[PDB]
């Protein structure tokens, strides 16, 4: 539906979710810490997305639901 | 039976299927809990160089970036799936309000105590 | 804030608050000055008496309502009747409440548009709104189809209505209504010797029709039965003594409903009235309105209306049909209960004609877009 | 005792003294405190809160069958259980849309006689040949089948 | 995966997954926006009830086929129509199947065109192919030739084949179908003073030529014994009462087919065109296609058309030929049961147009080796 349109909106959100970050002005320790901080924000994400994949089961049963109950209606 | 036999067994059904499903929520968030534990991998920075380290980091800012456009991809799924979750609520909803419009209202708000003021 | 739900009626004023199951003030509608001398000295002594006040001294005063049939024929008093219900009787200043009218349908625009002129500009409301009063009557009953017969006190109107569209060329209204079957009483109470005149007596001949009358089952049957004996002879005592005794005047008085020529009018009555604002709609969707026939109004309260419809209808009506008569017990109400309703729906919210809108258009607004 | 003390706590021993007190209002009193049988109609008449006739109609199965001429005083507390409001609200709607689908394992959008069975005794309850099948003529009254959405949606109404 | 059959058509949309005996789902395809006004809020009222919904709620709408004849007319019709049957009478996302839609011979090329390029840009389907709606009725029967008689709602098309080679120059079109019928049956109707003029009440007449209408075996006979006796006379229920007696206006619809001057067509009728349309073939596959002459479409399902057919050719085709008409029980789903076969087959499997392919040939790809 539009798919420029939605193409559009998917570029200002990831623009949203860009980020880029200094990669040659920390030392050893720092770069560790940064390592880590982006393994654990990575990792947040995959919670999140399993959340979301979840979330989706549940609803898409509730779609059946919902859908069989109306078919049942006639 | 006796209705009241009846409706104590639905009772304890019920209870115990939510037990059940108590349970088993509790067994899908440890499960999730470990199997997002398995998508990330373990990162051991010890004895790293700059450009090591630093290609490793930039690794990941691109995996990042890639799930912030699957993310993005199931959130526009998920944007559908709602949107036709509430559609399925307002039909069902419109059938069942051929005979269930007024029911949302306040009904015997205050006049029901002023009796005797004339 | 609540939104008040006013209903002007013609014959008693019913109003109160949205969102609660009955009006906090129901009173008759009239405005009478007093039509005699006056001798005594600072008894306070008003220069009318409207409302429910006019009902106690009604012996000096000459009552007259203010609104005839539907419209309103007497523009200053319908003002002070608006003005005693929200100052005396709701005792909420109007500066701070949406209204919600009522309207019969077919009615003259120009009353409509000067109804919303004075709400505006001497009450000053925020913003009023204007319903027809049958989908109302039609809400109350929880249905969302049907054909619903709201004989009022003023006019009796047919609207038919099917799963939300109603149908604006079945809409058929008759000006027989509460007034002219008391009218009718009062002439043929004069067979038997009782003469009624004044219109302070027009009020006692009112409560005659409303405590004694009904409405029967078979005409023919009930007007040789009480030509025989004398089981239907029920007394009534006046505001003063002298019972007096009423025959077969309790079953010929609102008889006139379904045999509008007793009163000189040609129309049909409403038991075919009904069946034709029916048969004007669409070929299928006759059985649903069959089904769903909803009585309203204050007049539609004669014990055994609800029957003698249905046998009416039934008679007319193809025989495979279903003829179904919901006669809800708070039928008097139901108008108000429905805008009660009506009024305390989220979706409704943005319908209100604000104030800034009239500024725009003048009182011309409440034909467009919001109705 | 589970269910029976449960609505013992639901009129807690509070609630126990007070319609103690109110019960010596309206017994015979000046008495050995033999207790009556006719206070739970007493009681009907004076607390305004009359019993409904199914509720008389258990206290006659339940007590006065036997010609007793009193009623005991866990039968009195078991009638005065079932004349105040120990509502279970009928749980919520979303409550019984997780409990049917736990119990449409098969994803049907409905709930099987087997399924009920299943479910039945999953909890260990006696589900014999007085059960389903009196569920049949009582738990489903559609029976067109199977067990519809709407019927067990609605079957379950304000109940525990 | 699997593949989604859909079939058009024009009265009847039928589809459903490859490989089964019956479409899924079957509706009417109409659409019809509400006409009246509406007076309740929040009834949650939409703007356009298309498929069988539109079939309860007709009395307050205006019905419109987007199908007209075989063409399509209304586009976007059209693609609320298909959105309505992939997502709510089917509920599978359209980007994980292939379809076979269906069209009937010799239509205009901006149809197809325009089909596969709604096809290929809205739904965004893997792959689709259009196949001809008489072949697939060919398929059915599990024969291999034949002369197939597809007489549909919107237009009856006859196409011979051979051992599976097409005859191209003998494919005869006539534009006489099951709603041309309709119309006549409601214009003959008038006869007897029921008249039918809605949009809506079309369907009741619908419904009454299915339940009630016949074909003659012979014309004059019936036409005399109706008008003697009444043993013919059928009555019918209208969706209000007021029931119907059908006289000789059972058997004088469905006549139209093989008299098409009753509705002021000039053509033959369809008894005529097969005859013609075998003739135009070659002089030594003549005894095949008699003896194996096939009947499909709704419109063939009338009570008596597989004898008069027979008879008819009888008394044109040459006294030694056999002729002996296919007329099996399952004739309305004919071709959709012949498109499931078709897409379930292994040799069909890489006749598909895939997506690759038509963003390298833009839609003019239909036309081309992947017919
Ligand atoms: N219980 C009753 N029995 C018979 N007639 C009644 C009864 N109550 C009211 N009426 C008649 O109905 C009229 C009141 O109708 P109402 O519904 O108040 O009119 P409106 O639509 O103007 O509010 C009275 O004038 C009276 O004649
Ligand atoms: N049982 C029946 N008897 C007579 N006519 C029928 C019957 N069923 C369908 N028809 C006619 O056939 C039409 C349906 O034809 P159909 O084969 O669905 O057309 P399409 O080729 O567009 O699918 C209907 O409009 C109806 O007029
Ligand atoms: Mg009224
Ligand atoms: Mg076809």
Same mark, same amino acid.
């Given at each position: 539906?539009?798919?420029?349109?939605?193409?559009?909106?998917?570029?200002?959100?990831?623009?949203?979710?860009?980020?880029?970050?200094?990669?040659?002005?920390? %030392?050893?320790?720092?770069?560790?810490?940064?390592?880590?901080?982006?393994?654990?924000?990575?990792?947040?994400?995959?919670?999140?997305?399993?959340?979301?994949?979840?979330?989706?089961?549940?609803?898409?049963?509730?779609?059946?639901?919902?859908? %069989?109950?109306? %078919?049942?209606?006639? | 039976?006796?209705?009241?036999?009846?409706?104590?067994?639905?009772?304890?059904?019920?209870?115990?299927?939510?037990?059940?499903?108590?349970?088993?929520?509790?067994?899908?968030?440890?499960?999730?809990?470990?199997?997002?534990?398995?998508?990330?991998?373990?990162?051991?920075?010890?004895?790293?160089?700059?450009?090591?380290?630093?290609?490793?980091?930039?690794?990941?800012?691109?995996?990042?970036?890639?799930?912030?456009?699957?993310?993005?991809?199931?959130?526009?799924?998920?944007?559908?799936?709602?949107?036709?979750?509430?559609?399925?609520?307002?039909?069902?909803?419109?059938?069942?309000?051929?005979?269930?419009?007024?029911?949302?209202?306040?009904?015997?708000?205050?006049?029901?105590?002023?009796?005797?003021?004339? | 804030?609540?939104?008040?739900?006013?209903?002007?009626?013609?014959?008693?004023?019913?109003?109160?608050?949205?969102?609660?199951?009955? $009006?906090?003030?129901?009173?008759?509608?009239?405005?009478? #000055?007093?039509?005699?001398?006056?001798?005594?000295?600072?008894?306070?002594?008003?220069?009318?008496?409207?409302?429910?006040?006019?009902?106690?001294? #009604?012996?000096?005063?000459?009552?007259?309502? $203010?609104?005839?049939?539907?419209?309103?024929?007497?523009?200053?008093?319908?003002? /002070?009747?608006?003005?005693?219900?929200?100052?005396?009787?709701?005792?909420?200043?109007?500066?701070?409440?949406?209204?919600?009218?009522?309207?019969? $349908?077919?009615?003259? /625009?120009?009353?409509?548009?000067?109804?919303?002129?004075?709400?505006?500009?001497?009450?000053?409301?925020?913003?009023?709104?204007?319903?027809?009063?049958?989908?109302?009557?039609?809400?109350?009953?929880? #249905?969302?189809?049907?054909?619903?017969?709201?004989?009022?006190?003023?006019?009796?109107?047919?609207?038919?209505?099917?799963?939300?569209?109603?149908?604006?060329?079945?809409?058929?209204?008759?000006?027989?209504?509460?007034?002219?079957?008391?009218?009718?009483?009062?002439?043929?109470?004069?067979?038997?010797?009782?003469?009624?005149?004044?219109?302070?007596?027009?009020?006692?001949?009112?409560?005659?029709?409303? /405590?004694?009358?009904?409405?029967?089952?078979?005409?023919?049957?009930? =007007?040789?039965?009480?030509?025989?004996?004398?089981?239907?002879?029920?007394?009534?005592?006046?505001?003063?003594?002298?019972?007096?005794?009423?025959?077969?005047?309790?079953?010929?008085?609102?008889?006139?409903?379904?045999?509008? @020529?007793?009163?000189?009018?040609?129309?049909?009555?409403?038991?075919?009235?009904?069946?034709?604002?029916?048969?004007?709609?669409?070929?299928?969707? #006759?059985?649903?309105?069959?089904?769903?026939?909803?009585?309203?109004?204050?007049?539609?309260?004669?014990?055994?209306?609800?029957?003698?419809?249905?046998?009416?209808?039934?008679?007319?009506?193809?025989?495979?049909?279903?003829?179904?008569?919901?006669?809800?017990?708070?039928?008097?109400?139901?108008?108000?209960?429905?805008?009660?309703?009506?009024? @305390?729906?989220?979706?409704?919210?943005? =319908?209100?004609?604000?104030?800034?809108?009239?500024?725009?258009?003048?009182? @011309?607004?409440?034909?467009? /877009?919001?109705? | 005792?589970?269910?029976?003390?449960?609505?013992?706590?639901?009129?807690?021993?509070?609630? *126990?003294?007070?319609?103690?007190?109110?019960?010596?209002?309206?017994?015979?009193?000046?008495?050995?405190?033999?207790?009556?049988?006719?206070?739970?109609?007493?009681?009907?008449?004076?607390?305004?809160?009359?019993?409904?006739?199914?509720?008389?109609?258990?206290?006659?199965?339940?007590?006065?069958?036997?010609?007793?001429?009193?009623?005991?005083?866990?039968?009195?507390?078991?009638?005065?259980?079932?004349?105040?409001?120990?509502?279970? *609200?009928?749980?919520?709607?979303?409550?019984?849309?997780?409990?049917?689908?736990?119990?449409?394992?098969?994803?049907?959008?409905?709930?099987?006689?087997?399924?009920?069975?299943?479910?039945?005794?999953?909890?260990?309850?006696?589900?014999?040949?007085?059960?389903?099948?009196?569920?049949?003529?009582?738990?489903?009254?559609?029976?067109?089948?199977?067990?519809?959405?709407?019927?067990?949606?609605?079957?379950? *109404?304000?109940?525990?």
């Amino acid at each position: 539906g539009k798919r420029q349109t939605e193409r559009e909106k998917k570029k200002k959100i990831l623009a949203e979710r860009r980020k880029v970050l200094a990669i040659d002005h920390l %030392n050893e320790d720092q770069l560790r810490e940064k390592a880590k901080e982006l393994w654990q924000s990575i990792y947040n994400l995959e919670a999140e997305k399993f959340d979301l994949q979840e979330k989706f089961k549940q609803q898409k049963y509730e779609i059946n639901v919902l859908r %069989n109950r109306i %078919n049942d209606n006639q | 039976i006796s209705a009241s036999r009846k409706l104590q067994l639905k009772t304890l059904m019920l209870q115990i299927a939510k037990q059940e499903m108590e349970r088993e929520a509790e067994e899908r968030r440890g499960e999730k809990g470990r199997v997002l534990r398995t998508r990330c991998q373990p990162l051991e920075l010890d004895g790293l160089g700059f450009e090591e380290l630093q290609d490793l980091c930039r690794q990941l800012h691109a995996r990042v970036d890639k799930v912030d456009e699957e993310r993005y991809d199931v959130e526009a799924k998920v944007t559908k799936n709602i949107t036709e979750i509430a559609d399925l609520t307002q039909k069902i909803y419109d059938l069942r309000g051929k005979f269930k419009r007024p029911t949302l209202r306040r009904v015997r708000i205050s006049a029901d105590a002023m009796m005797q003021a004339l | 804030t609540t939104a008040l739900v006013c209903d002007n009626g013609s014959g008693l004023v019913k109003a109160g608050f949205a969102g609660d199951d009955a $009006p906090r003030a129901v009173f008759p509608s009239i405005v009478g #000055r007093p039509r005699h001398q006056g001798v005594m000295v600072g008894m306070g002594q008003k220069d009318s008496y409207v409302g429910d006040e006019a009902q106690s001294k #009604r012996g000096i005063l000459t009552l007259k309502y $203010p609104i005839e049939h539907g419209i309103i024929t007497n523009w200053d008093d319908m003002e /002070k009747i608006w003005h005693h219900t929200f100052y005396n009787e709701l005792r909420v200043a109007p500066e701070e409440h949406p209204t919600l009218l009522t309207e019969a $349908p077919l009615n003259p /625009k120009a009353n409509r548009e000067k109804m919303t002129q004075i709400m505006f500009e001497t009450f000053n409301v925020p913003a009023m709104y204007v319903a027809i009063q049958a989908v109302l009557s039609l809400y109350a009953s929880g #249905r969302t189809t049907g054909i619903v017969l709201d004989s009022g006190d003023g006019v009796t109107h047919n609207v038919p209505i099917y799963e939300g569209y109603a149908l604006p060329h079945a809409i058929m209204r008759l000006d027989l209504a509460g007034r002219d079957l008391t009218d009718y009483l009062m002439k043929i109470l004069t067979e038997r010797g009782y003469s009624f005149v004044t219109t302070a007596e027009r009020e006692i001949v009112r409560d005659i029709k409303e /405590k004694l009358c009904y409405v029967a089952l078979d005409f023919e049957n009930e =007007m040789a039965t009480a030509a025989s004996s004398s089981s239907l002879e029920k007394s009534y005592e006046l505001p003063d003594g002298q019972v007096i005794t009423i025959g077969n005047e309790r079953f010929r008085c609102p008889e006139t409903l379904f045999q509008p @020529s007793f009163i000189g009018m040609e129309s049909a009555g409403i038991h075919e009235t009904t069946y034709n604002s029916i048969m004007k709609c669409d070929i299928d969707i #006759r059985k649903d309105l069959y089904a769903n026939n909803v009585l309203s109004g204050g007049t539609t309260m004669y014990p055994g209306i609800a029957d003698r419809m249905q046998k009416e209808i039934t008679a007319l009506a193809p025989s495979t049909m279903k003829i179904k008569i919901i006669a809800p017990p708070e039928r008097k109400y139901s108008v108000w209960i429905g805008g009660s309703i009506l009024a @305390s729906l989220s979706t409704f919210q943005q =319908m209100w004609i604000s104030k800034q809108e009239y500024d725009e258009a003048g009182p @011309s607004i409440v034909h467009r /877009k919001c109705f | 005792d589970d269910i029976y003390k449960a609505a013992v706590e639901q009129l807690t021993e509070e609630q *126990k003294n007070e319609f103690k007190a109110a019960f010596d209002i309206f017994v015979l009193g000046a008495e050995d405190g033999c207790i009556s049988t006719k206070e739970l109609g007493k009681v009907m008449r004076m607390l305004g809160q009359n019993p409904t006739p199914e509720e008389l109609q258990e206290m006659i199965d339940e007590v006065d069958e036997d010609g007793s001429g009193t009623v005991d005083f866990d039968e009195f507390l078991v009638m005065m259980v079932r004349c105040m409001k120990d509502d279970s *609200k009928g749980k919520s709607e979303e409550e019984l849309s997780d409990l049917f689908r736990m119990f449409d394992k098969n994803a049907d959008g409905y709930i099987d006689l087997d399924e009920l069975k299943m479910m039945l005794q999953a909890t260990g309850e006696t589900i014999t040949e007085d059960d389903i099948e009196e569920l049949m003529k009582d738990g489903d009254k559609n029976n067109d089948g199977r067990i519809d959405y709407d019927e067990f949606l609605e079957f379950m *109404k304000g109940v525990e």
